[PDB]
Design a protein around this ligand. Sequence first.
Ligand code: CY8
Length: 441
Amino acid sequence: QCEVPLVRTDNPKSWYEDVEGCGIQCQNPLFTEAEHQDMHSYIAAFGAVTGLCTLFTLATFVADWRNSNRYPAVILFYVNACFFVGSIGWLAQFMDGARREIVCRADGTMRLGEPTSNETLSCVIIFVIVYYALMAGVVWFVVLTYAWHTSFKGKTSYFHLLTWSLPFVLTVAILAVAQVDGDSVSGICFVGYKNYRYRAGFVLAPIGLVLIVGGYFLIRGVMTLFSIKSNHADLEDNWETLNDNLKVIEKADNAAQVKDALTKMRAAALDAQKATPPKLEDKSPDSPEMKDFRHGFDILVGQIDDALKLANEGKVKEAQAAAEQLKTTRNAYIQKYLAASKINETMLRLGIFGFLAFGFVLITFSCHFYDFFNQAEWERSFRDYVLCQANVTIPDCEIKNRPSLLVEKINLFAMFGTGIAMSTWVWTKATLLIWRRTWCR
Ligand SMILES: CC1=C2C[C@H]3[C@@H](CC=C4C[C@@H](O)CC[C@@]43C)[C@@H]2CC[C@]12O[C@@H]1C[C@H](C)CN[C@H]1[C@H]2C
């Protein structure tokens, strides 16, 4: 009765749409066996590489767990933790005969509407292991960005309830609606393949959520470093040009250079006043300390304007004399706030890893968008192809459009590429000693 891609099944539960005794075949009808075994080889690579890289970092973080549980470094361990769990699920398919066990029902049809009766949970198990790891990962990614964010403006750890609960609820949720569909080319079960509304609601949207949140802490994070960094530079720049012109006023032999220098000094004196020093980054624009800063220049420029009041009249012997008195004013209201700023490489690399993680997560969001965007067509060209290839009666039947294997190879590059990058948090020149030190056993 049946005909490719429809396969014979006595099971009423597996019948396709309203066709008698015909369910949809397990192996994805939208891809050739060549595309399967190529895509499997892909995952086998990145799946295995990341799985090892992460476990190396897990195994290292526990080799100094005493001095590797303190924030913010402990985050990268839980970020790595989730990744190692995720890698497991993907690598599960390559076990001989598992890829068919995860995706196919009893009657040789691709798993759908899982969890279902009389069908082993080997599908929903894989879906849980992955979906939980994925979500627990990005939630811990928010923790990572938030920790880096506030390090300038902390032992408190009430994230655990949040990082472990939110993925759990989301997991139980998809199970409740029973929308764990299966796929052969990837070798994993996941939410809403047949019904992609669940995929958008449970994957695209939560990832889109952590993106805008995780970003805000990275955006408002670098702006805190951009402020501190640029402000010291702005103060340093002026202080130096100020001390140059100071050296020009003395060496000068006319009232023209002294006036010009005094103006170059005043032009820098003011531009330096319009900046929050790195020592007062945490204070308010209307705070007391910030007040003494800006007021310190109101006196300074006053001293300059006094000198200018002598340079213009032509009192060079007396204008240069005021420039000497500017040394003490300088040392008072400038040398104090100037300089003094250290960030530590601990936060530098967290910024690197904070941003590097953000990027590859944004890619994952992009993939699951397109996959969600064009699927409505992949349904049309399928339902038509089913009715076509069944109409064979005795080239014409050919699938119009399908999921781009490129988009997946891109996703699985970034999805794993993150875990590979997150694993290099412990690739510093200080970690080898940790392993040599514990090596004594
Ligand atoms: C087969 C199939 C699909 C294979 C597609 C999936 C969207 C995303 C990916 C990810 C990508 O890496 C590989 C390909 C994969 C798994 C798509 C969902 C719709 C459909 O499932 C329906 C079941 C239903 C019974 C009938 N109609 C069926 C088909 C329209």
